[PDB]
Amino acid sequence: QVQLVESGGGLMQAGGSLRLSCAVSGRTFSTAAMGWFRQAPGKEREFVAAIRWSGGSAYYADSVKGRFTISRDKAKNTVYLQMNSLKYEDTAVYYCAGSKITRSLLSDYATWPYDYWGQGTQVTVSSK
Amino acid sequence: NLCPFGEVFNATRFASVYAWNRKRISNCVADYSVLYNSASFSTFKCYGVSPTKLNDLCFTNVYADSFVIRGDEVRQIAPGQTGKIADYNYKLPDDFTGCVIAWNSNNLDSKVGGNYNYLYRLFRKSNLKPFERDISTEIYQAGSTPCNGVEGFNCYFPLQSYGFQPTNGVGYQPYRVVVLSFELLHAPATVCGP
Ligand SMILES: *[C@@H]1O[C@H](CO)[C@@H](O)[C@H](O)[C@H]1NC(C)=O
Numbered sequence: 001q002v003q004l005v006e007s008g009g010g011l012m013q014a015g016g017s018l019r020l021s022c023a024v025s026g027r028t029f030s031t032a033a034m035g036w037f038r039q040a041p042g043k044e045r046e047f048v049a050a051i052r053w054s055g056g057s058a059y060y061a062d063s064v065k066g067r068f069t070i071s072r073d074k075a076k077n078t079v080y081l082q083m084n085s086l087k088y089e090d091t092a093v094y095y096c097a098g099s100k101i102t103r104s105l106l107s108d109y110a111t112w113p114y115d116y117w118g119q120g121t122q123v124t125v126s127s128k
Numbered sequence: 129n130l131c132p133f134g135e136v137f138n139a140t141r142f143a144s145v146y147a148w149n150r151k152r153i154s155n156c157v158a159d160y161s162v163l164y165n166s167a168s169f170s171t172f173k174c175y176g177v178s179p180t181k182l183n184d185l186c187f188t189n190v191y192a193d194s195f196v197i198r199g200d201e202v203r204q205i206a207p208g209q210t211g212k213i214a215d216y217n218y219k220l221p222d223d224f225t226g227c228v229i230a231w232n233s234n235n236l237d238s239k240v241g242g243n244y245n246y247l248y249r250l251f252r253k254s255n256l257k258p259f260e261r262d263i264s265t266e267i268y269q270a271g272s273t274p275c276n277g278v279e280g281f282n283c284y285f286p287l288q289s290y291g292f293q294p295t296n297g298v299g300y301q302p303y304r305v306v307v308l309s310f311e312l313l314h315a316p317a318t319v320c321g322p
């Protein structure tokens with residue numbers, strides 16, 4: 001029924017850029033949100049960014065402010081993560097996620113549950 | 129020319145309360161006994177009319193408003209009540225002539241893992257007037273700085289999901305609500321009892 005399909009990512013040098021795409025089939029997220037999460041080895045899966053599907057307002061983890069941008073194209077039913085100024089500690093498996101839940105405060109999407117998940121995409125940040 | 133109360137009460141799909149539905153009923157025979165004799169209803173409260181006397185009365189129009197709220201909010205669907213639903217979602221007039229009917233819809237409207245498709249308006253600049261409907265999704269300015277359509281500090285999306293799960297307490301179970309408004313104008317009274 002509902003599929004979140006990630007593309008992009010992989011290897012990039014520190015200070016460089018990557019762009020993740022997540023194409024949604026079988027649903028639109030209307031008044032709720034899509035987001036990105038990441039999981040590094042030994043660590044809990046952590047919130048990166050969320051976007052209100054209808055209005056496009058974004059909410060970011062402090063760790064990626066001024067570096068990562070979440071955006072979406074309604075016509076393509078796709079959400080994006082632009083990852084600039086890459087740091088070694090950005091190395092992780094990145095997941096796109098979709099929420100069923102309309103929350104008034106966009107900051108709630110940092111903690112409320114997501115019912116839909118992409119497959120996971122490895123991002124690796126390398127030296128020189 | 130039996131009034132289509134079935135289409136209202138037995139609709140597959142019900143509206144979110146902020147986007148409450150209205151059906152105008154006219155030019156038909158109303159059997160109100162189908163409603164007042166039903167064991168299905170947890171709330172059946174009439175104002176300015178007696179439910180058993182309804183089959184004896186004639187009206188110009190009947191309006192049937194319908195939506196879903198949580199069980200502990202059904203008390204707000206009453207003249208003069210206050211709370212998030214009466215204030216920002218669905219407001220009865222002080223001089224209401226009609227009936228408020230509700231029933232537990234946990235079996236249809238709750239899902240394992242949650243049904244979040246029913247919304248309510250959480251924020252609004254002022255209270256609704258009676259029978260006003262607001263379906264806007266403008267970002268709500270909670271502070272002194274304009275939002276310019278961007279959510280953030282004191283700039284909120286105005287709607288929020290109910291989270292209906294079948295294991296919720298009755299107070300947080302979904303209730304389907306029908307409000308019947310009885311209108312008598314200077315015209316032929318087109319909705320009569322048998
Ligand atoms: C709704 O359907 C049930 C089951 O068929 C029936 O008992 C009831 O009278 C119907 N309600 C109305 C108002 O017609």
